[PDB]
Amino acid sequence: GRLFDAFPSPYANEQAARYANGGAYPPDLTLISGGRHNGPNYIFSLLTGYRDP
Amino acid sequence: NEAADGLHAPHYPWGHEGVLDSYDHAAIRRGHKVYQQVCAACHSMQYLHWRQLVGVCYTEEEAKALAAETEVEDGPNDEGEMFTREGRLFDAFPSPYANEQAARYANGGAYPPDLTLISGGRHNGPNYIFSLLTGYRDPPAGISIREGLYYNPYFPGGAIAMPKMLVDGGVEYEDGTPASASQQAKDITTFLAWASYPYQDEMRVMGIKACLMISILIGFAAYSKRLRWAPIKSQRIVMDVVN
Amino acid sequence: QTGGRFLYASAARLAVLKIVMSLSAAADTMALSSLEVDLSGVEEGTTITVKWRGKPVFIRHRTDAEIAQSAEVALSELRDPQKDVDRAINPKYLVVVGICTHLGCVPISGAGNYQGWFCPCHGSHYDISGRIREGPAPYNLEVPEYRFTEGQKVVIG
Amino acid sequence: VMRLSEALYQTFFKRSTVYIPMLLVGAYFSNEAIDYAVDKMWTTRNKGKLFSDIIAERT
Amino acid sequence: PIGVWSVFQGYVTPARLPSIQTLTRVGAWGGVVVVGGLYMVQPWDWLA
Amino acid sequence: RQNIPLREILYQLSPYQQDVIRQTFTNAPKTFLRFFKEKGVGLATFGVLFFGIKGYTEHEMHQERLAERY
Amino acid sequence: RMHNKIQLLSVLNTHLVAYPTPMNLNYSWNGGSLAGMMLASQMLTGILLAMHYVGHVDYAFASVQHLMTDVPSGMILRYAHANGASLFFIVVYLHVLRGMYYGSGAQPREIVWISGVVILLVMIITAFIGYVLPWGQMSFWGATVITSLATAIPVVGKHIMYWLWGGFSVDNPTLNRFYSFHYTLPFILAGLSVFHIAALHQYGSTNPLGVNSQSSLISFGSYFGAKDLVGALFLALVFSILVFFYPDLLGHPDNLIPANPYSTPQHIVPEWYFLWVYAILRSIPNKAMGVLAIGLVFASLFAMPFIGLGGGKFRIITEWLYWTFLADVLLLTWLGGNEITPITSFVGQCCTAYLFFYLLVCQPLVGYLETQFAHG
Amino acid sequence: RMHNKIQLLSVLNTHLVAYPTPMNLNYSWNGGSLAGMMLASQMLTGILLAMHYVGHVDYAFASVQHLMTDVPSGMILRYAHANGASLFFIVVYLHVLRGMYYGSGAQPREIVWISGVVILLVMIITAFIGYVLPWGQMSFWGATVITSLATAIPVVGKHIMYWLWGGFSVDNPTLNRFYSFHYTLPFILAGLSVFHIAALHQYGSTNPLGVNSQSSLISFGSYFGAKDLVGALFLALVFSILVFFYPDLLGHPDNLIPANPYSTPQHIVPEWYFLWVYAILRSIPNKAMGVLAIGLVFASLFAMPFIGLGGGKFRIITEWLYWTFLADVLLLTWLGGNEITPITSFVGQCCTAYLFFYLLVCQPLVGYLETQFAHG
Ligand SMILES: CCCCCCCCCCCCCCCCCC(=O)OC[C@H](COP(=O)(O)O)OC(=O)CCCCCCCCCCCCCCCCC
Ligand code: HEC
Ligand code: HEC
Ligand code: HEC
Ligand code: HEC
Ligand SMILES: COC1=C(OC)C(=O)C(C/C=C(\C)CC/C=C(/C)CC/C=C(\C)CC/C=C(\C)CCC=C(C)C)=C(C)C1=O
Ligand SMILES: COC1=C(OC)C(=O)C(C/C=C(\C)CC/C=C(/C)CC/C=C(\C)CC/C=C(\C)CCC=C(C)C)=C(C)C1=O
Ligand SMILES: COC1=C(OC)C(=O)C(C/C=C(\C)CC/C=C(/C)CC/C=C(\C)CC/C=C(\C)CCC=C(C)C)=C(C)C1=O
Ligand SMILES: COC1=C(OC)C(=O)C(C/C=C(\C)CC/C=C(\C)CC/C=C(\C)CC/C=C(/C)CCC=C(C)C)=C(C)C1=O
């Protein structure tokens, strides 16, 4: 890779991503912080908030 | 330069040239069969679909059976992989190569161009195509041809990379027409001329109706113009000036 | 003057119709209104979604418990009453278009209190058979036209 | 010299709300006649070359 | 003062209102737009 | 609107008291000849200059092509 | 005079330099020049934007991202064009509320009011179909929900709907035609704005006192150029704050997700300036009745010069009722961003009923009572 | 009386219905209405084509083909646009030649001639950037050859060239910005046409006699509406023939090949209506001198109302020299389509010199001699 190249993708398409993750698509993380209400707070809480039901 | 321009092609009496004339749809059908058996080994026609041949060239069932004999890549499936399937009416005509570079590699560096718009994409289109296909002549004095190239005075420059491909009896027509090289060339030229202008018959019918309607309306508008201007064109002015 | 005005009216109508019939659906749009789906690659108890005319169609291989539960739903509880036998010819294979008649949203399979379809836009709720259970959706989910093929295939349209 | 009739004037010409529907039905029939004449001339000239001629020939 | 102010002041009498013949001549334009729409769309024999 | 002092008598006839296009067939050859009589010199000098210069240029171009031959 | 010899200079002098204007106009008469400045800004930013935008599915989102991160000054241009629609609607709404407060549409300025209402409708359509263009989740699903509301007209429903879509769902033909319609409509906005200003110049403007002001008129080009410049500088301050410090404050985070026709978001709400109409539509439990009420609001807006009696101060009952109307409209704007709940449905129904009551009952009848009290 | 109550009725009545017009106008005075109708036709068919065109180098040619075959009535719209451009240029060129023959730019109509020259320059730029949109071989290579004329300007030539391209070569940003500029410039043409027509209505038209016509004026709407309809129908006949029977007659076959930046055609030629400017450029073996000569041609066109003496039929020496000028411009049109050759270079140089001689020497001096002959 070179500087003009994009960041490498883990999979080839959406369907292989759903296949490797039980039918759920891991969303693209470039605009995920602006893509959620109260973005960075929600991301931090979600990353550190796996608690008991 | 004359050699760079190439030899001009004569004007052949095509039956669809006049504005009152339709295509010869039997020749389009025989021209497509030359395309499938000789042309399509190295030419793509990427803007044609089997749906457009229906009602022009084949019935629905004939075109479906023709499309079902082709392998079309489709996908991705639920496992994220690419598979193949039978072609359908909405599918485009198969391309012999995946890309331009392998097409160049299979043909000594020269890329065989797409034939959907080759008739309208050349000056003196159908005549040049017919004379190029039937015109692989002996080179004149002082003109040498390198290996991998063949002489054709209708090709600009005189050195083409396409060899002689039409041979006598190389296509077996289903209507009993004997297939010489000239008959095959005329039929494929007719098919390519249809491919460049697929709606020529409908355009000509609409043009005949439009020209008739506008020609009648010109007379009616001239009548209504002269009726309005009549009290002015026939007015009488009397004055004391004599000069 | 009337004779000329006949052709004036004809030409005006023809031009207006030629302008309007350019926003209509193109030929390749019309050619892509058909679909064939193989049911051999469908697992039981799983809902697959296919693109039929841009509309997500939910095909779920219904289990016998799901068939019995859909047959046990009374028409009185349904806002728009329709029996499960009146929607699908085969109770095992269900072909249901997932568009709300309320505004045009898409339900979510595998979520809901009735073990069916839950619409997240306005609280609309659907059962396993495509019938309204709760919410502002006034009409049941549409079952498209389809026929069974001998080679375990379903052609929609 | 030649002159439009009075009784035909009082019926189809004196009011625009009667003149306009007559205009539309005349426009419809004029378009039908022009379509018929153009199609008949085109099909007569190009007989044996169209696709429908081949299809009816194969019956 | 054009509109409801004209009728509040008493300027709209039985007179100065359109006659029955005027309303019929204006009301005859209802068939023209119907015939024009049917000419433009042409839904032949669509009446039930 | 630009008062113009003028003394005249003007007469005008109704357009439904005369014919519309019948005299157009009588006057058509005369109008054709009058048009060509009036614009004859300009059209002729245009044609002479354009076609003469074009013909001279095309002739010398053909001679130029012939001079390149062996 | 030099302007008396060229006809272009004569018109420009007459309508921009020496035009007689009342001298007691306050700062609530700067709405129109601000609206014109916002229209010009939107046209300039969009024409610059269209040199880097591709109006096709599978390229639209990526072209907007390439505009944002790779085009020099492209982020400024995009954020300016996005927030300029909000500021344009803020200014035009305050302009309309000024006209509602002072009775500015009355005789002889009914054509000015009617051309304004036409301009507002074209502005709404322009902003909606321009919001579809980035091709996010909010764009796709709002275009789906609004255009699939033509299935309320009987018989001729889905025919019109499928002709609008160019297909059977919102797809690439819908986006491709929405780009052309959105490029084209602002020039109609500019022409209608020129006609609207030319209609006002026939009789001149009203004044805050609401009396005849022919005795006290001053030149426009000297006195009301700097007064417009002050308000333009305030608007530029707010605009610069919105672009550089809070660029995504007025938006929706879901429009940063690429559009998925098979997955719908939890809450589908439009931009804020469409929310009051959305609340009116969503409050009524019938689609055809909601479209009828939306049409009736604009019909009552058109009928306002012919039914509305009563102006600013010295007409104090209608002056007080204006604030209830303003509260009602702002409540409808707040309700459109909430979820459908029985209490919110009841409150939205009451707000819509009061909006119709004020527009159709208070303005003629209370105004007539005020005229009978004052000059009876 | 009814048009006295509304401004918009009054302006329309004054400038379209009851506008006085010389009674002896012949059919050479129909070029303006035909040019306006062709501009309206170009705007309508272009707006309709923009709903299916994609301005990207990977989808432009393919979307053109898809519009040709799959879109209902798309072939009619595409051929109508491409041949309506040529008919627009035919009508405008005949309009300008009418003005040159009659000397219509003279006092008091200098503004009309100057706005006309402005309109023609905008028209030329509009058509040139519209031709690049199909992204064929001629579309690519003509834009490459013509925008490479900026490097004739010293020091800052390549910088302006790279700024216009958006890169080091003609590529996708060039196509996108050309699409935006091409959508935009027709609305400037419509505004310029409105200004140009309103400039003429100050004094009226000239007549074929070349005398003052204020004694014999008739209403425009009753009389010249039908006379304009007749010419519109003659234009519609030619339009129908070109669209339906010979659609690629005025085109080039190389624009049906997709663009290739690594293989140029053997004969790069423009459309026919830019061939005289191209012949002027090719005849001079210096790029800066060729660009200067084109600029001097347009400067001489601007300076016509102030250096030109000599008008219609009764001024016979300039009337005879007009036909020599017409033969010269058609020879320039023919020479542009031919290859570079010593005799074509010589003949093009002589033809350009004669065009300059006619514009700058014949029109002032011979006009002054014939004024002294007639009235000295
Ligand atoms: C070598 C290549 C061979 C190519 C052969 C084909 C060339 C083109 C076809 C032939 C063209 C010649 C006849 C064209 C007639 C067109 C009509 C016309 O002119 O009428 C307009 C015009 C009509 O006037 P109106 O009817 O009043 O409009 O007629 C005239 O006024 C007469 C024009 C005569 C002037 C041109 C004569 C031909 C020029 C040849 C010059 C040769 C120079 C040789 C110098 C070197 C010698 C070593
Ligand atoms: C000469 C004046 C002219 C005007 C005015 C004009 N165009 Fe065109 N336009 C052209 C030309 C030339 C082409 C190239 C046609 C060709 O060769 O395919 C073109 C092509 C186009 C294309 C590309 C599609 C195609 O067929 O190549 C679009 C899109 C387009 N024009 C839009 C517009 C719009 C939108 C307007 C007006 C609002 C407009 N045009 C007005 C001359 C013009
Ligand atoms: C629905 C009503 C409405 C809308 C929307 C509207 N206007 Fe106004 N406008 C008016 C009225 C009424 C007046 C007269 C106010 C007065 O004189 O009391 C006015 C006055 C004006 C003025 C004169 C200065 C002023 O602000 O009073 C300008 C400039 C103006 N409008 C421009 C615009 C522009 C530009 C737009 C939109 C892009 C617009 N208007 C939208 C109704 C409207
Ligand atoms: C009344 C409002 C309004 C006007 C006027 C307007 N636009 Fe915009 N336009 C919008 C909105 C809102 C968006 C959505 C922006 C977003 O959310 O990214 C938009 C989006 C766009 C886009 C898509 C790129 C992007 O960043 O979204 C383009 C291109 C565009 N507009 C061009 C134009 C052009 C060109 C004009 C005028 C000639 C214009 N606009 C005038 C409201 C408007
Ligand atoms: C370079 C010159 C030039 C150009 C280009 C030009 N005009 Fe003209 N036009 C004139 C002149 C000069 C007149 C006045 C001639 C007269 O009245 O004798 C005129 C007159 C007119 C008239 C009145 C009647 C007539 O036909 O003479 C109209 C209408 C008109 N122009 C419209 C247009 C339109 C529309 C365009 C282009 C889109 C255009 N013009 C382009 C110079 C021009
Ligand atoms: C979340 O969802 C929603 C949106 O989405 C983000 C919205 O925006 C809106 C706001 C829209 C409203 C109130 C209606 C807009 C008005 C009209 C007339 C609909 C637009 C009509 C179209 C697109 C028909 C096609 C016509 C076009 C493109 C132009 C026509 C041309 C001319 C007039 C010259 C609401 C309520 C909404 O809930
Ligand atoms: C004596 O001399 C004169 C003439 O000569 C005989 C004339 O002919 C005319 C009439 C002029 C005409 C027909 C020319 C047309 C005028 C113009 C300004 C052309 C430019 C206008 C366009 C392209 C309009 C299209 C744009 C629109 C509708 C805006 C977009 C909005 C929508 C699509 C909804 C006049 C007044 C005249 O005095
Ligand atoms: C096939 O191809 C070709 C063309 O095409 C159809 C041509 O015409 C030409 C030649 C044409 C000439 C000499 C006349 C037209 C000349 C020019 C310079 C056109 C003007 C356009 C320019 C400079 C492009 C820049 C665009 C701008 C500035 C956009 C406008 C926007 C603003 C001013 C804000 C040739 C050779 C050509 O082989
Ligand atoms: C009650 O008293 C009044 C006011 O209140 C004090 C007003 O405010 C106004 C109107 C104010 C105007 C006209 C100025 C505001 C600006 C407008 C509407 C347009 C904005 C344009 C700008 C900033 C520049 C645009 C630049 C260009 C180059 C576009 C033009 C394009 C070309 C030349 C091709 C009026 C008439 C008035 O009576």
Side-chain angles (χ1 to χ4, degrees), chain G residues 61 135-142 254-261 263-265 268:
Chain G
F61 212 82
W135 205 243
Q137 272 276 75
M138 286 331 281
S139 306
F140 171 79
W141 283 105
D254 277 346
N255 212 8
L256 274 174
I257 317 160
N260 191 282
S263 167
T264 184
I268 310 184

Side-chain angles (χ1 to χ4, degrees), chain A residues 9-28, chain B residues 76-81:
Chain A
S9 280
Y11 302 118
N13 44 16
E14 158 164 318
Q15 279 84 26
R18 301 197 164 264
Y19 179 65
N21 283 95
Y25 181 50
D28 176 68
Chain B
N77 45 5
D78 278 356
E79 286 90 352
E81 286 258 17

Side-chain angles (χ1 to χ4, degrees), chain B residues 1-2 5 219 222-228 230-240, chain F residues 6-16 18-24 65-66 68-69:
Chain B
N1 202 7
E2 285 181 70
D5 271 297
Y223 188 90
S224 280
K225 191 259 168 186
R226 285 185 56 92
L227 179 70
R228 176 58 48 82
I232 291 188
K233 294 294 190 80
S234 68
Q235 77 195 342
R236 177 61 75 205
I237 298 177
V238 63
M239 294 177 288
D240 300 329
Chain F
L6 192 85
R7 176 97 180 95
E8 80 176 2
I9 316 288
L10 177 59
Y11 292 106
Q12 273 183 344
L13 195 57
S14 178
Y16 311 128
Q18 53 206 295
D19 64 334
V20 186
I21 53 151
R22 188 171 192 168
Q23 308 313 296
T24 311
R65 293 286 266 263
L66 286 183
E68 291 170 350
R69 285 190 188 182

Side-chain angles (χ1 to χ4, degrees), chain G residues 47 51 53 176 180 183-184 198, chain H residues 7 47 51 176 180 183-184:
Chain G
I47 286 162
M51 304 180 204
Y53 173 73
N176 210 339
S180 179
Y183 189 82
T184 302
Chain H
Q7 181 184 359
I47 281 161
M51 302 168 194
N176 220 338
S180 187
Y183 199 94
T184 315

Side-chain angles (χ1 to χ4, degrees), chain H residues 33-359:
Chain H
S33 77
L34 294 196
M37 283 180 220
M38 288 312 295
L39 187 56
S41 166
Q42 281 297 97
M43 287 182 78
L44 171 60
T45 56
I47 281 161
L48 286 180
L49 289 184
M51 302 168 194
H52 317 266
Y53 178 71
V54 178
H56 196 283
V57 285
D58 295 322
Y59 288 166
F61 196 89
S63 65
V64 162
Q65 297 319 296
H66 157 263
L67 168 53
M68 280 287 260
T69 53
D70 302 343
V71 171
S73 296
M75 196 179 264
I76 296 176
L77 291 174
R78 188 266 187 275
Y79 279 150
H81 202 68
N83 284 300
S86 289
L87 284 184
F88 194 27
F89 267 93
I90 283 170
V91 167
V92 174
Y93 278 152
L94 287 185
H95 194 71
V96 175
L97 284 168
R98 199 275 319 265
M100 284 290 301
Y101 175 81
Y102 281 102
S104 300
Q107 151 177 357
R109 284 164 259 258
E110 301 97 322
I111 305 299
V112 193
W113 183 270
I114 284 162
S115 47
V117 181
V118 166
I119 280 170
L120 172 63
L121 280 170
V122 178
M123 267 180 56
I124 283 159
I125 297 164
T126 305
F128 171 71
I129 64 190
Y131 193 73
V132 185
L133 298 189
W135 203 242
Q137 274 275 71
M138 281 306 152
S139 295
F140 172 80
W141 281 106
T144 304
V145 166
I146 291 304
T147 51
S148 287
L149 293 187
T151 196
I153 295 175
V155 185
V156 289
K158 293 189 290 180
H159 298 143
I160 293 175
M161 200 175 64
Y162 293 150
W163 181 77
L164 188 73
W165 286 350
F168 292 93
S169 65
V170 181
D171 213 350
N172 189 40
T174 312
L175 174 59
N176 220 338
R177 73 191 47 181
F178 271 32
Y179 183 42
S180 187
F181 279 127
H182 190 52
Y183 199 94
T184 315
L185 291 179
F187 279 95
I188 297 169
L189 276 171
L192 281 173
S193 313
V194 167
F195 163 70
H196 175 101
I197 287 177
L200 192 64
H201 275 219
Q202 193 190 347
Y203 297 109
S205 294
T206 68
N207 55 75
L209 281 189
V211 304
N212 190 275
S213 55
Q214 299 180 9
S215 64
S216 310
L217 297 168
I218 48 167
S219 298
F220 177 79
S222 42
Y223 291 105
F224 284 85
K227 196 179 223 285
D228 287 345
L229 177 65
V230 171
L233 283 177
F234 284 100
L235 180 65
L237 181 64
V238 188
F239 191 78
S240 284
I241 289 169
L242 274 165
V243 169
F244 293 116
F245 291 132
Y246 306 94
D248 265 0
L249 183 63
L250 297 169
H252 206 275
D254 280 24
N255 217 19
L256 278 178
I257 317 173
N260 189 179
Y262 314 110
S263 65
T264 178
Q266 273 188 2
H267 305 297
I268 300 182
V269 287
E271 295 266 19
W272 65 268
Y273 43 80
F274 296 147
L275 277 181
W276 59 282
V277 190
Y278 197 35
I280 287 173
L281 184 82
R282 290 170 67 187
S283 304
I284 304 155
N286 209 304
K287 303 298 185 289
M289 290 185 79
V291 172
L292 277 171
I294 297 155
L296 261 64
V297 164
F298 277 104
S300 306
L301 273 180
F302 277 117
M304 271 304 114
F306 312 109
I307 79 164
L309 302 160
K313 301 178 173 68
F314 303 127
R315 270 78 65 91
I316 53 185
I317 309 170
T318 51
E319 192 262 319
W320 180 80
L321 290 160
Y322 165 77
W323 303 96
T324 318
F325 157 72
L326 172 66
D328 187 72
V329 296
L330 286 178
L331 279 164
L332 281 180
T333 299
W334 174 76
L335 276 156
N338 294 268
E339 69 192 8
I340 292 302
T341 286
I343 194 77
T344 60
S345 84
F346 165 75
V347 167
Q349 280 157 18
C350 281
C351 282
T352 317
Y354 192 78
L355 165 72
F356 282 127
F357 173 74
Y358 173 79
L359 279 186

Side-chain angles (χ1 to χ4, degrees), chain F residues 40 43-44 48 51-52 56 59 62:
Chain F
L43 289 169
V48 169
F51 285 104
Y56 172 76
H59 176 73
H62 190 280

